[PDB]
Design an enzyme around this catalytic site. Structure first.
Site, short mmCIF file in Angstrom:
data_model
loop_
_atom_site.label_atom_id
_atom_site.label_comp_id
_atom_site.label_asym_id
_atom_site.label_seq_id
_atom_site.Cartn_x
_atom_site.Cartn_y
_atom_site.Cartn_z
N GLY A 11 0.78 -1.24 0.00
CA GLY A 11 0.00 0.00 0.00
C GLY A 11 0.81 1.29 0.00
N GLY A 13 0.95 5.45 1.20
CA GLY A 13 0.49 6.21 2.37
C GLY A 13 1.36 7.41 2.73
N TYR A 15 3.88 9.58 3.00
CA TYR A 15 5.28 9.68 2.56
C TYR A 15 5.50 9.03 1.18
N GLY A 16 5.14 7.76 1.03
CA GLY A 16 5.27 7.08 -0.27
C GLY A 16 4.92 5.60 -0.24
CE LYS A 33 5.56 5.53 5.34
NZ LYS A 33 4.96 5.84 6.67
CG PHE A 79 5.63 -7.16 8.34
CD1 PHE A 79 5.21 -6.45 7.22
CD2 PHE A 79 5.06 -8.41 8.59
CE1 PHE A 79 4.24 -6.97 6.38
CE2 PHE A 79 4.09 -8.94 7.74
CZ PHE A 79 3.68 -8.21 6.64
CG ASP A 83 -5.51 -1.76 6.91
OD1 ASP A 83 -6.71 -1.38 6.90
OD2 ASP A 83 -4.99 -2.41 5.97
CG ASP A 124 -4.01 11.07 9.08
OD1 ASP A 124 -5.19 11.46 8.89
OD2 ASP A 124 -3.36 10.44 8.21
C1 LIG Z 1 -1.94 -1.88 5.50
O1 LIG Z 1 -2.38 -3.16 5.06
C2 LIG Z 1 -1.33 -4.04 5.26
C3 LIG Z 1 -0.32 -3.76 6.15
C4 LIG Z 1 0.72 -4.65 6.35
N1 LIG Z 1 1.78 -4.41 7.25
C5 LIG Z 1 2.39 -3.18 7.54
N2 LIG Z 1 3.33 -3.24 8.49
C6 LIG Z 1 4.00 -2.15 8.87
C7 LIG Z 1 3.68 -0.97 8.25
C8 LIG Z 1 4.15 0.31 8.40
C9 LIG Z 1 5.17 0.89 9.27
N3 LIG Z 1 3.45 1.09 7.51
C10 LIG Z 1 2.57 0.37 6.82
C11 LIG Z 1 1.63 0.89 5.80
C12 LIG Z 1 1.64 0.39 4.52
C13 LIG Z 1 0.74 0.89 3.61
C14 LIG Z 1 -0.15 1.88 3.98
C15 LIG Z 1 -0.15 2.38 5.27
C16 LIG Z 1 0.75 1.88 6.18
N4 LIG Z 1 2.72 -0.88 7.28
N5 LIG Z 1 2.01 -2.08 6.88
C17 LIG Z 1 0.72 -5.83 5.64
C18 LIG Z 1 -0.29 -6.12 4.74
O2 LIG Z 1 -0.29 -7.31 4.02
C19 LIG Z 1 0.38 -8.30 4.80
C20 LIG Z 1 -1.32 -5.22 4.55
O3 LIG Z 1 -2.34 -5.50 3.66
C21 LIG Z 1 -3.34 -6.22 4.38
#
Ligand SMILES: COc1cc(Nc2ncc3c(C)nc(-c4ccccc4)n3n2)cc(OC)c1OC
Lengths: 295, 257
Positions: A11, A13, A15-16, A33, A79, A83, A124
């Site tokens: 995903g 979000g 920053y990038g 990230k 990790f 969400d 946020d």
């Molecule tokens: C956000 O949805 C999932 C998150 C994660 N894990 C994860 N772990 C740590 C993390 C951090 C520091 N920042 C982000 C993030 C990424 C994209 C948008 C916003 C935040 N994440 N995401 C793993 C998935 O798949 C295993 C997902 O899809 C279900």
């Protein structure tokens, strides 16, 4: 940077773009990230790294490393599995058990309490910024709009928070942000976990405002002193009556409703703090249940 | 409301770590305190020019002093350090920070855009992204919550004094931000209302009026000599009606401590 093999995208979000990645040498699974690199290092990133380096807490996602190179900036994170937004969607039919809601709110309130007593505003909080694991944990994430309030934080004229989870003070145009805005957000999320539907889902800024007024009653001077003097207040505001909370959040008990109204208190000065919320009669029997995560 | 007492304790701990080497200027072979003063004074003008917060200016200095604590800089590059620090401070602190092109501009085109951004990268490396530094300004605003009641002339004077401390590395590096702030706040409260360092703040900070003396004696000196000082940007800044023209207020001749 040659240590990490990119596993998959998870995903975008603020920053990038964010990747799940693995440490070829240790085996540790991380969230990368990525930032492309020309107005220098992005403001959001400078703030996120700078503030997260200080916030070491179990309910705040740990910034594990920052790799500084020529044309790319990478932020290494712990990790988590998904969400809260996605977990809510999977629960839609069955529902999130009240014990797990209690557990999540308790934990989030601990994270937020830690943030605030370390002069950090998150600004946020939304279900897609909160991250969960299979072991029943929940953690605050995306600190791109986070701000240090050693000095009071001035509000943006074009606001960059989510609409649905925005506090009424911001919508009415008050000069400074406040810890209270973060409490409001959790309140909205708390009710959403309970009802399976968003508490105030507004189209526009004024729609959002009115939705808060229809449910909690239109604020006046008795309720919130100085309401009418605020920049974006209008005398011609419709005057709705406050609604019976047992019709707003039906499945919640007296304690649940007690905390929720304190979290959604109109006056930001008298809105319950994260610290105080943790000591509310509601969390007297809190445990740490395990969620059932899909996919 | 609730987090305040925790924030003071946390900020108090954080100023010990984010503290520059006291006598770092003697280890800097090409620059002296004089040249640092000129730069800091220039940054005040930069600050007023782009209407940036006073907190931005404060941070920028903290960064500069820390960077210069571990990096030898020749005089011709000191400004590039100063300009990068400001840009970084602006990015951390300002809602809409000024564009890089703008910072390149105010240097009279001494450095290129590339030069400023490569410097920013280096300042970040040296400071290890630890930019959330605690300032004299941060402590002053926290201290202000203890006025009975609030007075903007009191505030504006304290701010002015605390700002003046940024210009002279001698003696002000000897003092933690919280101590300068304590001195500034007492001196302002004494010049304006005639009152002293309040009882509630003694209990909160632990600093007795006695302990603030060494700092007060120095600050009072800067205040008294301020009109004759080589750097004037701050006095100009604070003779504005916005800051109640406090830089025009006569300092008391003796602090009588
Ligand atoms: C956000 O949805 C999932 C998150 C994660 N894990 C994860 N772990 C740590 C993390 C951090 C520091 N920042 C982000 C993030 C990424 C994209 C948008 C916003 C935040 N994440 N995401 C793993 C998935 O798949 C295993 C997902 O899809 C279900």
């Amino acid at each position: 940077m040659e240590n990490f093999q990119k596993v998959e995208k998870i995903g975008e979000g603020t920053y990038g773009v964010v990747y799940k990645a693995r440490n070829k040498l240790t085996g540790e699974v991380v969230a990368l990230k990525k930032i492309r690199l020309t107005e220098g290092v992005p403001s959001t990133a400078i703030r996120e790294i700078s503030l997260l380096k200080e916030l070491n807490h179990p309910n705040i996602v740990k910034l594990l490393d920052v790799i500084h190179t020529e044309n790319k900036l990478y932020l290494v994170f712990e990790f988590l599995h998904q969400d809260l937004k996605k977990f809510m969607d999977a629960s839609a039919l069955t529902g999130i058990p009240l014990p797990l809601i209690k557990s999540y709110l308790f934990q989030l309130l601990q994270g937020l309490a830690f943030c605030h007593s370390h002069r950090v505003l998150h600004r946020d909080l939304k279900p897609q910024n909160l991250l969960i694991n299979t072991e029943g944990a929940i953690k605050l994430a995306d600190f791109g709009l986070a701000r240090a309030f050693g000095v009071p934080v001035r509000t943006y004229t074009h606001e960059v928070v989510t609409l649905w989870y925005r506090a009424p003070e911001i919508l009415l145009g008050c000069k400074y942000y406040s810890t209270a805005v973060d409490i409001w957000s959790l309140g909205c999320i708390f009710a959403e976990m309970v009802t399976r539907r968003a508490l105030f889902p507004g189209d526009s800024e004024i729609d959002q405002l009115f939705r808060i007024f229809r449910t909690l009653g239109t604020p006046d001077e008795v309720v919130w002193p100085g309401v009418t003097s605020m920049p974006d207040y209008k005398p011609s505001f419709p005057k709705w009556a406050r609604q019976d909370f047992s019709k707003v959040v039906p499945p919640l008990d007296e304690d649940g409703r007690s905390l929720l109204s304190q979290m959604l208190h109109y006056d930001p000065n008298k809105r319950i703090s994260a610290k105080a919320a943790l000591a509310h009669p509601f969390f007297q029997d809190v445990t740490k249940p395990v969620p059932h995560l899909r996919l | 409301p609730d987090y305040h007492e925790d924030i003071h304790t946390y900020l108090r701990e954080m100023e010990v770590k984010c503290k520059p080497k006291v006598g770092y200027m003697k280890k800097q072979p090409d620059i002296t305190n004089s040249m640092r003063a000129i730069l800091v004074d220039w940054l005040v003008e930069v600050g007023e020019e782009y209407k940036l917060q006073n907190e931005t200016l404060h941070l920028a200095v903290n960064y500069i002093d820390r960077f210069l604590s571990s990096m030898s800089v020749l005089r011709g590059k000191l400004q590039l350090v100063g300009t990068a620090a400001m840009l970084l401070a602006s990015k951390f602190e300002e809602i809409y920070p000024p564009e890089v092109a703008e910072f390149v501009y105010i240097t009279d085109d001494t450095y290129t855009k590339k030069q400023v951004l490569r410097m920013e990268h280096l300042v970040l490396k040296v400071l290890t992204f630890d930019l959330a530094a605690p300032t004299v300004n941060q402590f002053l605003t926290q201290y202000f919550l203890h006025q009975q009641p609030a007075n903007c002339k009191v505030e504006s004077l304290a701010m002015f004094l605390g700002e003046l401390s940024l210009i002279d590395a001698d003696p002000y590096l000897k003092y933690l931000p919280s101590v300068i702030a304590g001195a500034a706040f007492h001196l302002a409260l004494y010049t304006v209302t005639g009152q002293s360092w309040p009882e509630s703040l003694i209990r909160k900070t632990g600093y007795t009026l006695e302990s603030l003396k060494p700092c007060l004696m120095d600050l009072h000196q800067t205040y008294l000599k301020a009109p004759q000082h080589a750097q004037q940007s701050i006095r100009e800044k604070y003779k504005n009606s916005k800051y109640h023209g406090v830089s025009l207020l006569n300092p008391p001749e003796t602090l009588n401590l």
